[model samples]
Target: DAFVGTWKLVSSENFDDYMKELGVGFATRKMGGMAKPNCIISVNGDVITIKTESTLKNTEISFILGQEFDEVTADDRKVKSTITLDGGVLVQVQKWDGKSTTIKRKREDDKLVVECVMKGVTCTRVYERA
Candidate 1:
């Protein structure tokens, strides 16, 4: 239960640039920036479910550690995704169309911190337990 909780996004850095790296459309990127999603994570034995909810849309992802599965992203891109726990950080990698993004989520100073790297852009997002 290291990361099992309801977390609300509080801040994001360079998110627009990150979206651009993913080839997101201008309208979608702007709308995506307007959203502050809540990340709800649950656990059942070894399986984990992560749900992202916001005013725009909601997406749920279920996966086991190290297990790879197909996922349709918020930008509507289909990707192969995998989740793994490394040193108490939930590390996720999403691969699609010859590109990939690496995301790391962990706790810091009683807050949930998420860092995403795609190509050369690295974006950081902060969340708090809700």
Candidate 2:
């Protein structure tokens, strides 16, 4: 699949601001900003795996498209998460404590682009093939 690849973080915009808006603690937010995670995405039939590797912390999540599942964010928040494919983009919605966030991933010009949006704050992260 076009989405299956190893991607390295290239640039991020407004990530710190977005995390702050999500109520993340100061120390964690500071550490998270330095955690430039490399994303490894793989798809097999109905299953998908998204692995994030970084200096501060690493997270791996597996789920099937269009199915809801329990998820723990990197910050350790419990959420109900669902992933769906729309117009060639992979969209993930995570809800917890009455708040929600949306993460969208897509490939453009051989680059992997991720957009994270929560409570009116938006962060864009770009990645290159690794």
Candidate 3:
């Protein structure tokens, strides 16, 4: 599977701004800004799993393409989420409280690039193979 691998966080841009758009608190923002989490992705046929782990927090999500599911976000917000695979990129859209966020994950050279967009704020997180 193209996305079945472990990736280490290397760099991030505008993450704090993106979180701010989601209304994340000061304490959570402080902690999240300092933590660099590793992401593990798995694929079993139609099921895809993504796990992000760090000392501060851990999140795991499993879903199938084009299927809708209920999820509790890292900030404890409830959202309806749907995932899709398009042109080798994994795209996820989440909606909560009348707001929406989109996440796109793709491989670029030897790195995994993830883009998170919400409320006109965009954050880029880069990862290398781990």
Would you list the rank order by TM-score, best first? 2, 1, 3
The regions of model 2 sitting more than 4 angstroms off are none
Off by over 4 Å in 1: none
- Cα error of candidate 1 at position 129, Å: 1.2
Q: Compared with the true structure, what per-residue lDDT tens digits does model 2 show for residues 1-130?
A: 6889899999999999999987899999999997778999998888999999998988999999899999988888899999999999999999988999999999899899999999889999999999
> How would you encode candidate 1's per-residue C-alpha lDDT over 1-130 as one tens digit per residue?
5578999999999999999999998999989998999999899988899999999989999999999999998789899999998989999999988899999999887788999999899999999989
lDDT by residue for model 3 (8-36), tens: 99999999999899899999999999889
What overall lDDT goes with each candidate model? 0.92, 0.93, 0.91
The better-scoring model by lDDT among 1 and 3 is: 1
Q: Please state the error at residue 93 of candidate 2 in Å.
A: 0.3
Model 1 alpha-carbon miss at residue 69, Å: 0.6
Candidate 3 accuracy as lDDT: 0.91
